[model samples]
Target chain A: NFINLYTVKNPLKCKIVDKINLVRPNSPNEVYHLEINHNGLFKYLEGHTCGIIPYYNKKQRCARLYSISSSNNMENLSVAIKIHKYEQNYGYCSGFIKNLKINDDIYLTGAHGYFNLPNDAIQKNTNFIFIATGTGISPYISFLKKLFAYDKNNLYNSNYTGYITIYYGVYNEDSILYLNELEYFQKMYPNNINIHYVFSYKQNSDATSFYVQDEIYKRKTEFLNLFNNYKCELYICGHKSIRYKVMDILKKKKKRVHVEVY
Target chain B: NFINLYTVKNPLKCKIVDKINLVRPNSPNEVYHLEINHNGLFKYLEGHTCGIIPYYNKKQRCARLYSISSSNNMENLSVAIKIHKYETNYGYCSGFIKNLKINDDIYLTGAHGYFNLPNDAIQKNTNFIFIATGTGISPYISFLKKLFAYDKNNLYNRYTGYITIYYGVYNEDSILYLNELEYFQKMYPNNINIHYVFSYKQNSDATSFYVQDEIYKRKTEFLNLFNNYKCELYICGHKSIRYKVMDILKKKKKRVHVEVY
Candidate 1:
C-alpha cells in the first residue's frame, strides 16, 4: 500500500509551495502556515499529522509530527507551526521549518495520529462544538474548509442544518491564527456559526483575564443546553490540561467528546 | 535536572536484572516481566512509562514506550511487555526485548507520559477503584506495593482508604501477580478488595461476565464509596473496555483517569 510508502526510515521529498506568517509582527507569538506539495502520492484525511524530518546538510535527524491544517479535498498538505524558543536556543524542528524558503525541498513522512471527525457527523446532522487554543486551531481549519466547502465553492455555504460553534482561546487579539478566514466564515454563516474568543492575558475594557474554561463556566446554562443536546458532539484540541478543565465543567453531562492534546 | 538527563536523543544504558513469563504454557499469551537496573540515577512513579530503545548489535533503533510496573520506592525499574506479532513478522521492539538475557545491556530513555496517581491520594483518603485487564494490571502492582509497603512492612497498613480492583483475564491460570496479590488481600481483608473476572468461566447464574458486568453487580458498594468517600476511578486496558466501564460511573461526579494502548 502506498499509504506506508514513506516512513521514518524512507521519507518522500516534498517541496514547499507556500509559506506565510499568521500573526502580527507586534504580537509575541511567531506562528507560520506552510503548504507543501504531496504530488498525489498518498492519502490523508482531516486531523492527520505529517512527520517532518529535520534534515541539515547531509545528516538526517529525528522526525517531528505536525498536525495538518489543510483540508483532505486539496492536493497539497499544510501545517501551522509555532516557533518555540527553548531555554537558550530555538527548537530544532521549528527553526528548520521557519528557515525553509519557498520551492525548497524537504523530506516528509506519511500521515500519523488518529484524532479525526466521525464519519457520520455531517450526515447525521450532529452539532459541532470545536474548542481549541493556540496551535490547536490548525485541525479545525481543515474541518471548516471541508465541512463548508470553502475552497470549492469560493464562499461559505450552509450545506447542513447542524450548528457549528467554535470556542477559541488565545493570549490576545493579535495572537489569533487564521483570523480573516474565521471571520469570513462567521460573516457568511452568522446564524449557523458562532465564535467566542477567550483571551488569557489580554486587557479589555472589563479588564478580566479569562480562559476557555472560565468562559464556558460563565455561560454554564448555555453550554449545558448545548451539551445536553442529543445531536451535539464536542471536539477539544489544545494544551494537555485544557481537556480536563472542559471535561470537568461537563462532568455530569454526557456527550461525545473527542480530545487531541500535545 | 535529573529528569531531563535521559531523553530520546540520549539514553541511559540499563542492564536487565530479571525476566520471566507470567502466564502458563497452555495459554497463547507471551507476556514477560522485565526488571532493569537504573542505579538510582533517575526517579519515576507508578503509572509512568519508560521508553525502551531497541538496541540491536550496536545499531540504534527506534524507541518503544512501555508502562512501568514497579514502585518508585525501588532502586531498579520494571516493566511488563507483551511480545507482538505483526501479520508475517514479530514486532521489532518486542522481538528484541524477548531475546534479551539477564545482565544484557540495553538503552533506556527517561520516564514519559503523564499517567500517574494523585499526589495526595493517601493523605486525602481517596478511595481507589482500579479496573484493568491483562497487562493493564501492571501499574496497579506498583500502586499496591507502595500503598501497602509489602516489602518493608510485610503487610498492608490501614493508613489509607479502601481499594477495589476489578481485574479481567481470559482464564484463571492466566492471572498475573497471583501470589503477591493474594498475600496483600489476605493481609488487609477489610481494607482491600479484589475481583478477578474471567471471560471463559461461567458464573453461578450460568452466564459469563466481563468487568463491566461485575461492576454492575457490585454497584451498591461502588455507589456507596462514590457518595460517602472521596473516590478516584482508574481504567486501563484496550479501548473496548474503557468506556463500557466508564459508562457505569458517568453519572457520579468522581475523578476518573484512563490509559489505553
Candidate 2:
C-alpha cells in the first residue's frame, strides 16, 4: 500500500511485474512493454481515474503527459511506449524504464489526465478522422480498438457506420512506427478504416513527401462535406507545432476540429 | 552539425533520465531532465505545441502516456523534460533519455500540430482557462511564459487580457514539479492571471481539497458570468478522464465549450 501524498521525486510504492524488448538491432525505433502492480496506486487511480503525477525536469526544461491507456478492469496494469533515442540528448523516461529490474519498487505522486473515451453519443456518429504523427497514433489506436470492441461485444445494429481515416506522416517507411499493427487494425475493420501514409523526406513516383495536415488540406472539401452529412469527429496527435498549422487550415476552411496533442 | 536520427533502448533512456539520486535523494521517486537541441527541431515546432501520447501495454496490460514538460526556443535551442522514475516497471521515454550521452543521436519525428497561439479574433474575445494536473502543466506554463515574454518584449497584448487556471493535484507542498517556476510566473504577471490549486489530499488549510471538475462545477456561476462577458476557451492538460466531467458540466449548464484534451 502507498500513501496519497508524496513529493514529486518521492513516490509511495509500486511493483514491477514484467518487461519486454520490442526493438532489435538496426530497428527504426525501440519499443518497450512494462507491467507494474500498484495496489495502492491503482486504487488511487481507480477512485479518480487519474494515474500519477508526471515529472518535469527543470534542467532539460520539458514536460510530458501520458494518458492512462490501460483499463481499470485489467488484472495486471502496464503501459507500452516507443522510444526514439537521439545521441545529442538523452530521454529521461526511457532511460528509467530500461534500467528497471523485475520486482523493483518505484514511486509516483500524481495521477494521469482525465480524458475519457467517447460514449454512445460519439460512437453513434458515422464519420471519424484521425490525424497523428509519430507516436501520436497511440491514442487513436486505443480509441479505435475500444470502439471496435464495443461493436463486437454489443452485437447491436447500432449501425454506427463510419469511415475511419488515419493520416500519419513520418521521415520514412521504416520510421512509420507500428505500421504492422495499424495495418492489422485496418484489416480487422476493413469496411470502416483507411490509413494514408505520408513520407516527409523520402518520396518515389507513387509516394509523395507530404505532411498529414497537407493531405487533409488537399482533401479539405471532402472533410467539410463529411461534417455536413455525418456526425464527424476529428482527432489529432503528435508535436505541438504541427497542431498550429493544421488548426490554421481547418479554421480557414471553417472546419470544426478536436485535437489531442500527444 | 548533427544528423537527425538516433536509436537506443527505450527503457534504458527512462532509467537514465528518471534518476532519483539526481533529483531528490530523500524521496523514493526518481527525476531527470530531458533536453533537445532546438536548432533542428524548432522548424517543426515553431507554431505548434507538443502533447503526451497515452497508451497501454497489451501483454503486460498497463496504461500510460508520455508526460513531456519542457520547451525549446531560438535562444535556448533545446527541449527539456522532467521525469519521475518508477521501479516497478520499465519506463519507455524516461529510460531512453537517461541512457543517452552527448554526441549520440535519436529519431525525433513529427510535424507541428494545427493549434497555434491565440489569434486576434481568439485573443480579443477569448476568456482562456488553462486546466492542468501534475506534469501536464508544462505546456500551459510554457504558453503562459510565452505570453508573458511577449508582453515583456511588447510584441502584443493578445493573451494578456483575461486568463484563469485550475491546477489539480495531491497537495501543494508535495506537488514539486513546477511550483517554483509557476510561482515566479504568477508573481511576474500579477493581475493578468487567476489560478486555483486543488489538492485531493489536503496538506494545507489554505488550499482546497477537491478535484478540478468539482472546483469547476462549484464555479458554474463564475463560468456563466465569464461566458456572458466573453467567449470562453477551456484548455485542459493532465488526465483524459477530466474531459468527461467537464463535458457533462458544460452540457448541463448549456454552455458553449471548446476543450483541448
Candidate 3:
C-alpha cells in the first residue's frame, strides 16, 4: 500500500550471491534469478524494481531496472532479468550478470517504484488478484513470499482472509518463473495461494495464443465476483503490451488498474 | 481494474463526434479537444498517439502525434491536437482533425509509444515533476487522470508526496486545458500542484516567465524534493528545453542520480 520508496542510502557493497537460470538450457534466450547479498540494512517490499548501475567506459553505465523476486526479510534479495539478444546485441547488464559467477559485485541503486501491496492491503482481510508476465512475475514472487511463505502447516498472517489468485504469462513452459515454488505454495495452502501459468507461445484447442490477457478473459466473471463480493486488490505487472492488451477488458466500470511496466 | 488498449480494426470507420477549443480567442495557435466515438472497444494510457489518414494517398498520410487526455472508463475518448498552419500548407492530419465536425467520421486510428513511467513508478511512494509545453501537456493530463481522478478510494492518500506540473504555453490565453488542470489540482491539493508559464508574457517581477524559470527559479526547493525521496522526472516538449534542463540537472547527480535525453 504505502511503502515509502527507499534508496540504497549508501548502496551496500553487496556480492552477487548466485544466479539461477530460469529458462531451459537449450533455449537461445536466457533469464536469470540474480541473488544479491545484502547487509540486512536495505529493506524492501514486493514490487520494488530499481536501477543497476555498474561503471562502464568510466562515464557510461549499463543502466537497467529489475523486479525483486524476494522480500527484505530474507538474507538476500533476488531480481529476475531477461537476457535479450536484440538485433545481435545483448543488453550490457544482461550480458554482464549472465557471465558473472557467485561473489561478483554490482551496484544496485534506488529501490524505487510503487508496484507493491497497498498499506491497507497489508493490514486488511482483502482478496488479491495478481497478473504478470515473464520476469514481471518476479514481484508477485515477493508478494507470495511476504504473505504466505512461512509456517505452511499453520498458514500464518492472521490479517488476510480473502482468496488470492495470480496468473503468470510466459513465452514457453521453461520460461515460467518459479513454477516449483508456486506449486509448493499452492499445495501447502490450497485455499490461500492460487497460481495459474499462461504460455503465450502455446495454444489452446482453438490454437489462439493463450496469453495472460486470455487467461484473464477466462476468469472475467470470477474477477468480477472478487470485486463485487470481496475487498479485492488488483495488480498487473509485465511488459507494456500486457498493460495495453488486458486493461480494456478488466477496467470496465473499475476505477484504478495498478500496473508496472518495464 | 482491467481495461484493454485495443486498436480499431478499421480505424477509418471511427467517427469524430465533437470539438472544443482549448486555447482562447486571438491565440496564435489553435488546440482542439476532439471527442472520438469508438463503441467502447479501446483503452489507451497517457501519451498515446493516434493515427489519422485523411487524403488516402500514401504521401498525404501523416502521423500527427497527440497525447490522449481521456481516462479508461469513457467510451468517448478525447485527444488534444494543435492545428498546424505553415507558410503554404497546414499539417495534413492536423488540419483534417481541426476541420472535422460532429458526426463526421474522419479516419481515426490508435497507436503506442515508450514515453511512460516504468513498473517501479506504479506504486512506489515517490515525488514526481512533469514538465510540458503546448500540447505536450496532453500526456501529463492523462497521468493525472489515471492516478487521481480514477481512484475509487479518494481517501487512500498513500502518495504522501508532491506531483508537480510545469506547463509552458505561448501566453496565458493560449494555455490548454487550463480549467481542467485547476480542477484536478483543487480536487487533490494534498497531491497535485500546477504551475503555468507564459512565453509571450512576463510577470510583475519583470523576469522572463517560462517553464525553465518556474523550474530553475525554484532550484533549491526542487533539489530538496528530489533529495528527500525517490523522484521521477518527465519532460515533454521540444528538444531544446529537454537539453537545457538536462544540462541544469547535471549538477543534481552530485547528490542523486540524474537522467538526460
Tens-place lDDT per residue, model 3, A1-262, is 3233333344446678778887775344588878887666556677787667654212333346788888666787788777765331455566677677788777766576767776665467567888887777788878777776443345535345557888887766777777766776787678876777776442332232245775666776776777567756778776444564355454553433576754
Candidate 1 local lDDT, A1-262, one digit each (tens): 2244577767788888989899976577799888889787757878877888875321335677788887777888888888875331456687787778999988888877666777775677678888899988888888887777767456524466578888998877888998977988888778778999987553432222246866776777788788786456788887544565567557623437777765
Clashing pairs in 1: none
How would you class the docking of model 3?
Answer: incorrect
| CAPRI-style grade of the A/B interface in model 2 | incorrect
Candidate 3 off by > 4 Å: A1-11, A26-28, A56-59, A151-159, A203-206, A250-256, B1-261
Q: How well is each residue in A45-158 modelled by candidate 2, as lDDT tens digits? A: 321122333233212212234443344444555555565343223356666666678987754455543233445533465577777776666566546545555332344322
Each prediction's whole-model lDDT (CA): 0.74, 0.47, 0.64
Tens-place lDDT per residue, model 1, B76-170, is 87788888642234566878877899999888878766567888866776688888888888888888877776564444444557998999887
| Prediction RMSDs, each to the true structure | 12.7, 20.8, 24.8
Chain A TM-score from candidate 3: 0.84
Ranking of candidates on lDDT, top first: 1, 3, 2
- Give the DockQ (C-alpha) for candidate 3: 0.01
Between candidates 2 and 3, the one scoring higher on TM-score is: 3
| Model 2: fnat (fraction of native contacts) | 0.00
Q: Which one wins by TM-score: 1 or 2? A: 1
- What DockQ number belongs to candidate 1? 0.02
